[PDB]
């Protein structure tokens, strides 16, 4: 079942696939999960915010 995403915290690759670390709205870091990029079609804006942030810091 589906939940609200507060933000994207980080990203990584494993096994040739990209995953993103999600802060779930209304929960704390103890509940943070890694999610396959495929699960995140409805997280356009939070993904972009994250990507821009990473780009800013380089």
């Amino acid at each position: 079942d589906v939940f609200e995403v507060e933000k994207i915290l980080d990203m990584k690759t494993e096994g040739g696939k990209v995953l993103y670390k999600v802060r779930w709205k209304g929960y704390t870091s103890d509940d943070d999960t890694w999610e396959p990029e495929i699960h995140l079609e409805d997280c356009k804006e939070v993904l972009l915010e994250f990507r821009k942030k990473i780009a800013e810091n380089k």
Binding site: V2, F3, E4, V22, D42
Partner: peptide, 12 residues
Amino acid sequence: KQTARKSTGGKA
């Protein structure tokens, strides 16, 4: 609002 499936399983 931003939404997604939460993974409750994973590597064992």
